[PDB]
Write a protein that binds this ligand. Structure first.
Ligand code: HEM
Ligand code: HEM
Ligand code: HEM
Lengths: 726, 726, 308, 83
């Protein structure tokens, strides 16, 4: 048999930290993690152990190594139906990728509310805190293909399919609270501008090219979301550490028929955190799967992604109470004006079994709502409602995509629709039309009502002429970008300046850079001048004199728009690199590992080669990777214990390891003679804030390191990084 | 609630004769008829009674009569996701029809062998007389589209999917024992020649046009199957009353590895029976679904179609012992040389629930064989092996067509194939390749053996150069057509002459007619002269002197090639029209109806309007159809009971009903004053064979009518039918 | 007019070195370059300057910035056929990528033989040193998707379509002279092993994972091509500085019917050159389009890729 | 989209306009037209915004919907006048 005698080919079906075990399909890693959707897919899971290899017709194969030929050096024969079926299936494996958000990573989980929301909505999944709704969630980038890298600068999608008892509700959101454009008619133009340019299909996974900034310069409605993308919002550390938003104003409808406007939020219970740009870019080369792998390994470790669902609620009579239009999806609703009510929690606790069958084939669409929710006339939402039904017809092969297992409702579904490519359901109804007598009119319509009723639209009043015209109320483009800019910390603002300066430096036509700097001067002169300086552009006197846009309803900032202004750091699930030497102080290591364990922080033990080293006291320490093999990009903090520091003090790779972690603002902790490394990162004898140092790794040295990790990065180090070459 | 209070909308779930109740889905008409494949479809059967109407996402619908609009006379809104889902599914209901045999009718059933065939084949489904294998059978025409008519002149397909414990085996045959062409490379040429012509797409369901006969005149290999199509074999009475054949020689392989050549047969246990051409052509107009209807209603009545599988077996050492090549599919093996050995019985006993899901999506392919069977080098079979897998990728939408419920095996199937459009199975194997160690190499190959082994091809010797060349052994075209012609009764030979005469009359270019007559003169001079006389063509002295082809292995006829030469008639399931009048002799009708019921012959009571008539003694007689509504075309015989004959004696429809039945050779029985209709059909006072007449329907009147029915038609009447204008 | 007055939006229609001008579609950058295949594509080339914006049915569009709504803050109307055509075409832009070799970069060119090869083959494109055959060439990686990076460690494809006067001949080769496996029946197993693993779809553009090395360790026929892949052959500097091979033995047939066994080679006239691994892996991050860009800009500069 | 295999059905010869048609739509299965436009979006400067919108007018103008007045609530209701 081919597996090793000792069973080391098979991962334990228990939670294990990243790196400890090979990853596995979710039902084999966590067989007793169950939900109603995961149990309903049991009819289509297939196993493998102890079964014979067959054709798809059930014929057992004897030799799966060779084609049928006339003689053993002869021509292959057409009658080889086993070869032809196997190669035909392979030749047809691929389906079209999604037009946007082609790169994504997904998991199963569940949602439960914190209280009944019956007073504001009749949605059944929100009716009782003991109602547990299975979910499937896909996180994604926007521009790149399905084989593009994860840690690009981009908006991220955050789509959740809720399998409710009254239907599937898909909340198809992104990680910023607005979008780039106002009207769905312009979506092909914006997406064509951001995607690879049509002559040569470059660049992949990047907005930093001429056509994107040409469109932005000509369409100032885009500037708000462009500010978010150029911020560190555009480079999240993990899908676990970003916010979600539905963007549009929707409606909640209660059993008395009252409509409330709502915008939806997801708040990450692990907190908000982002990479820095050079780290994100380098990680696209060293691990283009970093966020897919982080999500999968968090769930295999038990560090389940958790989010709180939140609603901003605005009464119908307050529709015109703000100085922006609630229907304009380039405007956000500041939390200082309308707070987020926390409504429930979602936990992602199981990975798929098969990526293609469950993630690639999943179909999310924001028109999939349930009684108790409704739309508004937001003109970007209104066009979305057409596009997701349409695109699924070619991506997933026809109109029966709801029969693909991951998309199936878990509640009953019955109607008079028939046929279509790869129709699975075999209808026995004598009728395929209504009204009918021949089946006593079943399945029957259901009037709307407080529970288990049919869907009726809220009877909004519509009055106007048939026009292709933008509302005048949507014609203000600079106040929300300014509010966002003024809400950032000073280091977040520098990172935004740097994001625009990097991007516009890769625009080849200089007039486009100049037109973007002119737009920036309508938002904030400090930002405009800082970007201009980096491009060698000088503002004109007219530009220096543009009047700043107005505050938003008297606000001149809102700290909820910053990643970092209000502390919300959480270290569970983060990872520290420990740089070993060939004679490690074991007492340093016991102390380190114990304190990390107590906070749920993982460790990775690194050295010069694969294998093991032995500690001063004889403990054998298995090495996970080389310094060069698992770079600092992939960890949150670096600790270097004592022992034979002499042994690594000269290693180019160990030095670079600490230079790169330093440049990227990561906490570094140095014990005993590991303080020799201070010289490579140019740290003064009396120390520096963000470098933890002591004689040994006692319990105090660990608390200080863990406090630095809760604050994510050492922002105060920014003015010091320029003068290490890394 | 729209059903009648009396429950008359719903058919009884019990066997009922044709017309007695509305037809229904098989699992509602016959819920207790079960087999392993029908039970395995339960996971996808969907009911309807008592369920709410929903979208395909499970959202209940309140109003399925209206689109959402801005005001009740306003424009429809794009946000109407319930209208766009319903119309999207409707707009994509169609899939491509099959390239050939697009018109077909299908049913479920089961097969059992009479004894174990373990001495000649290791196929599991033939190993044990107590082993029952579910089947699904589709019967079809060849040329017309899925909306074409059933009783055209054409070859018929007879395809059986056997759901065995060792894999699906599809036996994909037709109703004649040879095909038109020798090498699959010509199949697009032949099928383009018989199909509607490409400029104008005419004619549907007919080979009587110039390109067909141009190809036949240029490719004499076609003449054998053309003879069978021009005979009454081309116009079967029902799928129940035709033979089936696999056409190719295949191999049986036993557990000791011995190969035996085999050709497959189906014998209809209801006997052989065909229409006559004027009746078939007219029936394409009055009921283009006649065979689909007759099949479905026979199964609803309990008149299950039954067939016996038989094998012609030739030892490997006898390959070259005949005047024709066993591998040439334009040659038959006469049963006088190699008898058919009875192997088992197939009963079709349940209709589908949904025609699209089960019939239109079924995929049959003759490359789907099982261990114990193998192919030969027949060059028509060899190209078929390529075509069926290929066509299914576009007809059924991708390479996962085996996951469409009707096509799924009932036995296990596991392999390393993944992905593809509308992938249903979610594989949990950690490996998607072999050899692998990470799942200990499962699923694993299985060596060949006596039972439950892997498939291995028979190690036939191949020797020769790579050539595109027809074997010289295949270059003989006229002997099997002549054997067929000489085996027909004189009335069957007249019907062949009439088939060729009518067909060639529709060929516009007269030189093509003359080239076909010349080919007939190579087969049999009598046939050629009779067709030439009907075409106004005179044979040349050269044609008159062509020497006939040789006998086939000494035979100058083989009666098993005739439909009628050896009586095999069965009356159960046949139907009789009874022509009512407004004061029927109730004693005649009691005697008639119970005689027919005793022999399983159905009746249809006809009159000049719907509703009821009252008999001499007050019995209320319900009318099934009018004389025009249910013409004589649709029945096998006609009975006119006594009573007030003057009610119907001058009814042109009643009179023409008898004239048409008379012309089409059907038995007619006239009781009492119904003998006044003798003048309509010009019968002598002293009577004539084929017309039953007495003073009442008692004594031997019904036995005589039933005797005529068992002989199917009154062939002795053929010379008498010309002196009738009908 | 949205273009700048000075015309600096439009790249010069003449050869210019990398970075000197924005890149452009080839018939705009190099209008004077022609061959028989480029000339035969002219009936489907569509321009743009001075034309009105239309639907695909040729109806001129007045307002391409807004959906049709009932009132300017109202719901979008289903009768907006201009919005639905534009979004429907957008919704259906994608087609499946190639099962293997999905990442690739291509250019037009021409081929000419040095002398007639009629003594060994009757192939018309090889019959006359004056006979010029248009080509279209696509270079590729093997494992990654169409949106993966160029300077991965992988084998590269080198596929040439020759548009001859006796038919299309496709020479579909790679940049090493052997393949990993011996019998096509095993291709899906080998390709499944090298591709991203099926539970989680990682890693992209990399053979450095368990399933690839499990297959290799169990199928020693793979080791030859694995040695090439682990060498600097697996990380070419440019598609211009790698070899090409047809791998298989084919036959040449002359007019007298004689068969000669042949294996096909492409020799880069710019020579052989590879990156080093740390450089290649870092370039996947900093410019995942580096080989597609280098090929396109070499052609816009006149530094045409040449192979023998 | 399903009957004719994708969104380029207007390029099947019988369905093609005989008048000009130019826009920024790209790709799709069996795409025949090879666009040379450097831009595939508007507004653009890189091709001076061509092809360009056309105001409505008496002849050769862009399409504009008649500005019918719409007044009603969002309802799934048959007009009583149709009963
Ligand atoms: C507020 C603005 C929007 C947000 C938050 C949004 C978000 C998303 C997300 C998260 C996905 C990926 C879902 C998945 O993981 O499969 C997606 C896919 C998609 N989006 Fe949107 N989107 C927006 C606007 C639009 C507009 C205006 C259109 C077109 C009118 C559109 C058309 C599509 C299409 C065609 C797909 C691919 C869907 C599929 O193939 O199943 N999006 N969008
Ligand atoms: C002995 C000669 C043949 C017989 C008895 C035969 C019989 C049949 C039958 C009965 C069907 C319909 C199965 C069903 O009901 O779905 C069928 C379909 C078909 N036949 Fe054959 N056939 C013959 C030769 C050929 C040849 C030579 C080719 C091509 C090389 C061919 C290609 C096809 C194709 C493409 C279909 C449609 C299959 C589908 O869409 O699933 N047939 N044939
Ligand atoms: C000597 C070994 C082989 C070489 C040199 C080779 C080379 C290539 C190249 C260069 C391409 C990309 C063509 C392009 O640029 O579009 C390609 C594509 C492909 N190869 Fe091969 N390959 C080999 C073996 C195989 C085998 C054994 C199979 C299957 C039996 C296979 C199936 C494919 C398929 C399905 C495609 C995608 C073609 C398309 O979508 O148009 N290759 N191969």
């Amino acid at each position: 048999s081919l597996a090793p005698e000792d069973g080391s080919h098979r991962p334990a079906a228990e939670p294990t930290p990243p790196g400890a075990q090979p990853t596995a399909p979710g039902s084999l890693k966590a067989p007793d993690t169950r939900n109603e959707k995961l149990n309903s897919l049991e009819d289509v899971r297939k196993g493998s152990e102890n079964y014979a290899l067959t054709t798809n017709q059930g014929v057992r194969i004897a030799d799966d190594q060779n084609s049928l030929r006339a003689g053993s050096r002869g021509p292959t024969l057409l009658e080889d139906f086993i070869l032809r079926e196997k190669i035909t299936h392979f030749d047809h494996e691929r389906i079209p990728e999604r037009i946007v958000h082609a790169r994504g990573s997904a998991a199963h989980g569940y949602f439960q509310p914190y209280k009944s929301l019956s007073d504001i909505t009749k949605a059944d999944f929100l009716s009782d805190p003991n109602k547990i709704t299975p979910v499937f969630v896909r996180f994604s980038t926007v521009q790149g293909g399905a084989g593009s890298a994860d840690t690009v600068r981009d908006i991220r999608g955050f789509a959740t399919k809720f399998y409710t008892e009254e239907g599937i509700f898909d909340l198809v959101g992104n990680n910023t609270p607005i979008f780039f454009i106002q009207d769905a008619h312009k979506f092909p133009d914006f997406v064509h501008a951001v995607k690879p340019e049509p002559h040569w299909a470059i660049p992949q996974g990047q907005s930093a090219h001429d056509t994107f900034w040409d469109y932005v310069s000509l369409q100032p409605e885009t500037l708000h979301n462009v500010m978010w993308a150029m911020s560190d919002r555009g480079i999240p550390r993990s899908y676990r550490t970003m916010e979600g938003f539905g963007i549009h104003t929707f409606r909640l409808i209660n059993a008395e028929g009252k409509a409330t406007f709502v915008r939806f939020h997801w708040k990450p219970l692990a907190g908000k955190a982002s990479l820095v740009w050079d780290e994100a870019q380098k990680l696209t080369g060293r691990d283009p799967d970093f966020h897919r792998r982080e999500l999968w390994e968090a769930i295999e470790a038990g560090d389940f992604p958790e989010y709180e669902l939140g609603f901003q609620l605005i009464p119908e009579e307050d529709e015109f109470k703000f100085d922006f239009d609630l229907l304009d999806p380039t405007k956000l609703i500041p939390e200082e004006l309308v707070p987020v009510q926390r409504v429930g929690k979602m936990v992602l606790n199981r990975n798929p079994d098969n990526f293609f069958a469950e993630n690639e084939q999943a179909a999310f669409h924001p028109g999939h709502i349930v009684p108790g929710l409704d739309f508004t006339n937001d003109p970007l939402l209104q066009g979305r409602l057409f596009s997701y039904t349409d695109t699924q017809i070619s991506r997933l092969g026809g109109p029966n995509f709801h029969e693909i297992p991951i998309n199936r409702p878990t509640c009953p579904y019955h109607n008079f629709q028939r046929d279509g490519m790869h129709r699975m359901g075999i209808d026995t109804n004598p009728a395929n039309y209504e009204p009918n007598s021949i089946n006593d009119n079943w399945p029957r319509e259901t009037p709307p009502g407080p529970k288990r009723g049919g869907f009726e639209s809220y009877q909004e009043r519509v009055e106007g002429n048939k026009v292709r015209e933008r509302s005048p109320s949507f014609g203000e483009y600079y106040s929300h970008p300014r509010l966002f800019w003024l809400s950032q910390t000073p280091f977040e603002q520098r990172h935004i300046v740097d994001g625009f300066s990097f991007a516009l430096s890769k625009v080849v036509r200089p007039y486009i850079r100049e037109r973007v700097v002119d737009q920036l001067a309508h938002i904030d002169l400090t930002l405009a001048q800082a970007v201009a300086k980096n491009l060698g552009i000088e503002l004109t006197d007219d530009q220096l004199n543009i009047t700043p846009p107005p505050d938003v309803n008297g606000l001149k900032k809102d700290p909820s728009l910053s990643l970092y202004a209000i502390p919300d750091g959480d270290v569970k699930g983060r990872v520290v690199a420990i740089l070993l030497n060939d004679e490690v102080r074991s007492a340093d290591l016991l102390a380190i590992l114990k304190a990390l364990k107590a906070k749920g922080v993982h460790a990775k033990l690194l050295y010069s080669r694969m294998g093991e080293v032995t500690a001063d006291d004889g403990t054998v320490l298995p090495i996970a990777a080389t310094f060069a093999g698992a770079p600092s990009l992939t960890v949150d903090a670096v600790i270097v214990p004592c022992g034979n520091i002499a042994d690594i003090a000269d290693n180019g790779d160990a030095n670079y390891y600490l230079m790169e972690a330093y440049k990227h603002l990561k906490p570094i902790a140095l014990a005993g003679d590991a303080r020799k490394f201070k010289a490579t990162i140019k740290i003064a004898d009396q120390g520096e804030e963000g470098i933890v140092e002591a004689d040994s790794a006692d319990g105090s040295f660990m608390d200080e390191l863990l406090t630095l990790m809760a604050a994510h990065r050492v922002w105060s180090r920014i003015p010091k990084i320029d003068k290490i070459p890394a």
